[PDB]
Amino acid sequence: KAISLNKAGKVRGQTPKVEKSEKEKALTGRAAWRAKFKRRQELFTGVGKFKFNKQG
RNA sequence: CCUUGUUGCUGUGAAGGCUGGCGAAAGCCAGCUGGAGGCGGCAAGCCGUAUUGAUCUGCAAAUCAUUGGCGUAAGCAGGGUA
RNA sequence: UGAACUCAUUGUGACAAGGGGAAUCUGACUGUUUAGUAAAAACAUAGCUUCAUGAAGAGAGAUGAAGUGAGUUCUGCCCGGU
RNA sequence: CUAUUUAGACGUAGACGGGUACGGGGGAUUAGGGUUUGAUUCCGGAGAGGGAGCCUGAGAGACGGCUACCAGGUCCAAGGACAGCAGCAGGCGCGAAAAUUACCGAAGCCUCCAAGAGGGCGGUAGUGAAGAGACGUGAAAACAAGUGUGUGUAAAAACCACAUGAGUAACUGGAGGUCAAGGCUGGUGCCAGCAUCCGCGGUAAUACCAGCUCCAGGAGUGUCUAUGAUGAUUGCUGCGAUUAAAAGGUCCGUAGUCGAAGAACAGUACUUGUUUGUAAUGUGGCUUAUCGAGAGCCGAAUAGAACGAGAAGAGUUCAGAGUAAGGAGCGAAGGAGGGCUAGAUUAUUGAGCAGCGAGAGGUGAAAUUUGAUGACCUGCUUAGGAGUAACAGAGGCGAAAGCGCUAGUCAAGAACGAAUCCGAUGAUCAAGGACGUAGGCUGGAGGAUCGAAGACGAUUAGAGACCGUAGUAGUUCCAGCAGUAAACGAUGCCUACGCUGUUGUGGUUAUGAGCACGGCAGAAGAGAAAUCUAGUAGGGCUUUGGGGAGAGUACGCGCGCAAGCGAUAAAUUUAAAGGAAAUUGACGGAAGAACACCACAAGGAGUGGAGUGUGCGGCUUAAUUUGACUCAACGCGGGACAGCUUACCAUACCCGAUGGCCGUGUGAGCGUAGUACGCGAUAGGUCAGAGAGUGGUGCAUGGCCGUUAACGACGAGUGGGGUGACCUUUGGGUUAAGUCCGCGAAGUAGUGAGAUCCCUAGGAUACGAAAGUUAUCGACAGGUGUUAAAAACACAGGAAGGAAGGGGCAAGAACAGGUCAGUGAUGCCCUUAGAUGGUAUGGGCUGCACGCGCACUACAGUGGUCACAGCAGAAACAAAUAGAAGUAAAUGUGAUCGAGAGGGAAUGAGCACUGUAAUGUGCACAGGAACGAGGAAUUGCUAGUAAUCGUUAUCUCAUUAAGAAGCGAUGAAUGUGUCCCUGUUCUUUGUACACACCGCCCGUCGUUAUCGAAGAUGGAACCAGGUGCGAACAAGUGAAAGCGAGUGAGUGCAGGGUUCUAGAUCUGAUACAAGUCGUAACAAGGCAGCUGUAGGAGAACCUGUAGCUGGAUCA
């Protein structure tokens, strides 16, 4: 029974190209760690609930 | 059908037997002894495959040479008888 | 059965004396046949199967008639015609 | 190595052959016990393209020495010459795979005749994210990498010191679960892709493709491939074998592994001391480079060996010792244990003869078939070959397979009783040996019954099968071969420790009990449960399993006359497996209780047959619009259609939210006796996008209905049992109803029923003066009779008597039940000015060869006709001279008619009514069809019921009832039961179904792919041997010429041993979305299934014979 290869690549053609927006140089090493440690202060409490990423 | 004549040399090695080993048994393995067979190679013989040889006014109204098949046997043969 | 020495082509010295292997068709084997153009795959053979008979100087492990062809393995279906 | 003598040497504790390998010190992982690796700094071995010979030397069978062959090369003037990077750089190939044709009088060492010469050995840098350390990528005031001097070195660079500039510096994999972190926004619509595994995507994708935010590790992070761990899935420590994979059919037996008490003895294992035995690595430490890997120094150490010591266990010996260890023997007794000899009561067939005179046989029902040549049945005679009924059992015997009549005879064994004898003789078992139901095979004997194969008769779409008739090999015996079973208690053999009650068999007994071999019922433990040959446990020895498939198959080998059997692989494929047991449903062609005139039995009236009225299918037509199909479609869709209804056909006529773009008072359109007159923007073409439809899909839905069912079921706490899915427990009586009464590891409250309305029947003491109306009352099985309780009848009184009668309301769960043509209830698809939207005039829905469902008049006399009366539920009625809607009718009295004067179908010329229109209805006169009580079947109904008779101021309705829904008149007949039919509920029952029987599933045939066997004829390579021939070198002998043992490379010719590969054709397996033919298995799966063996067959499979329950029976 018939088979064909006519459709290879389709979705990569049809998805509209969007440009990457600019951003700062991010931290690295201990610098990144001081930044994370201040954000997560709630979580280091044994009560209440932190949430890393929410879209509401 | 009755009465007779005619088996020399060699190979292979069945049945039966004796020793030695192995095995709990049954019975297995060696070496020797024995000498069966419409069994092998030949002789005397009996036959007739090839050369499509010789001969074809023949040696001969069926022979000759070399080459072949069987040869311890449903083998070959004289006389008497049907 | 060994060993040594010896020879100018080497030694079953003349005579006598197997060529061998791989496959296929066919008949089991030894045996027989067209005297005088055919020796064969043809005939025979052991074994297998069928048939008829209580008659005998013979008495069913008998006496005659046919077909197939040792051994192994198989031998299906049809009694309308003759 | 050679001469003569002796036959040895080595093997199941694995010889010999083949395959594979540099060996250790050490490395990786690791709680422990282990599993894997070692070309690779140290030690020892071998080699220098492949083989072989050799001179020199203290030392080489040397290759940066020589000589010859074989395979390859280089230069030439063609005559000859040279050469070997598994040294250091470097090049080409091969591969998925690995650096500079660099500097060196310095460090560590080696070489010479040396106050010096040589060394790619060694050192120094360059190159590369194989590995391992320490740190940058900012701080809150103030941060690498640069540069210059000095150092450093053999010379350098880097490193470090001081001094100058300054302000540079993160990516890889992810975000549904395992597994840390987004239902974010846009594309795509089972596509494209993602995903180790599970799984995502069919237009609402937290999983694809991207954007944006988060997470993890970080100068690093992902992937592929080997291995160690995960893993008690290789089990010494430490798994399993009743049913999941797994105990050999039973014995004997060698090698092997394992083996009393008592008294003594000896030191080789065993354990331990002292001394040896380890550079690096590793282990326990300390000291110096800024720190940390690194470097330097210290201490102890494995296996292996030398010499002493201790004697528990192991070992050796002894007999004034004699196992709930074995063998020999004695006494009395028991048993379908085995071989042989001689007898037996019946039965089934066959023949003979006699009696009798028509059928016998076989089945669910029948046909083949046999009988007047006398069957069948009943007598008497006989001839054979099998078998041992009932007694006969959770009884006995045997190693298992197996063994059942009675006597006699011949060997051996088990158990029991007891002061017999010998003394370790024993347990288990590769190899080897003996037995083994049935079916089968080789030869003989025989042949009653039964019966594979083969042949018929039936049944079926087809039966080749199941059933019946018949019939052969076999089924029996003797002498052998064979070697398998669901050969199963699916539970190896010895030996232990272990609770109670009961019942057997054989001996013995202080009569209390024991010993051997059993059955049964609990308990406690155990186990995933079911259950227990399964409890406790490092006792000994053998067999044996490691996810499904392919496969107990291929090749080789051993046995067999054959049939075959024993033993046993790879390639390939796949996420689970009809894997195990237990829980809830659905299903069955099961079993057991119940119940009911919408079930039946015993009783009433009909339907099915005629004509007509009406609905359904079929056909016709321009159109005859359409839903619904077992109960639970068919006078049903409130479906009595002239128009309307109306969805269909013919002709004709009529009709548009908004927004953008394009035009307009010089007129964008409209009215008309329509073209010249009247009115004017209002309402104008095209793209988007809205808002009709009796158009489609009820398998996209809501609501409402119908049906299960008008049935007894049905949720909550707390409590008991089970690991849990789950059950609340023994099913005995009653009602319409788990409605109730008993009893319980259960007990307490609720829904449903019931109770709770409304109508109909009786009732003033209330109200009225009109004469009726309404009523909180009245009935409870209360009374009597029936001797547990719960109910019950039968009487009696009573207006009403066992749910007073009749309605009405009415659990949970269900169904792919009906309706989109009821709905401004509704998703999605379709049409939409030449409409699938409205309207009008007509035509159809009403056509007519024909099959069906439900009604109406009938078939007369228990009638027809004439007159006259007279009565309902209650109360409604211009007039009418033949006649043209209305206040009962059956019925009561008198006449009449007399067995087609019953009956009114098709049809004629008329006379009126309703209506917009007759085609519809009424009236008068004719006319006068079938039908003379209905085949197979089939439907309700228990009392003011059924049937009869009219009537509707009820519904449809201008006019049309032969339809429903009421209402009254006249008024019966039969049981008082049952589970047989027909159904419906509950409890036990089986399962490979859960998507739930419309389920699931087997095998041929045909088409594709992929991997493997065989096969006439064949190819490589690569090893060792056997024969030829023989280059180089050569001891010896010779003045010399020569001659030449021996060591041998290469190469002839035959063979073998290994590994690959070709091959016409045949034959397996696996995957085939769904192709063709059947339906073999799973329910009693429609003939219960399965194992062995033998025939047969399109194919699953079918048939004989023995076996098993994993069966549909613990009886």
Side-chain angles (χ1 to χ4, degrees):
Chain A
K1 181 175 183 181
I3 296 290
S4 189
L5 304 182
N6 301 133
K7 293 174 182 179
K10 197 180 90 169
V11 72
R12 180 177 298 278
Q14 299 199 125
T15 61
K17 288 174 182 179
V18 172
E19 285 289 328
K20 294 191 84 72
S21 59
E22 70 167 34
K23 286 184 284 292
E24 311 92 330
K25 295 286 181 180
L27 303 179
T28 56
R30 63 155 171 80
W33 276 107
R34 201 206 297 183
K36 276 148 61 178
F37 180 68
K38 294 191 178 187
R39 186 178 183 258
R40 293 169 186 188
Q41 284 297 297
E42 289 181 292
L43 182 58
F44 296 110
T45 325
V47 296
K49 287 185 175 74
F50 185 64
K51 188 171 180 72
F52 294 82
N53 176 33
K54 200 190 184 177
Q55 268 55 56

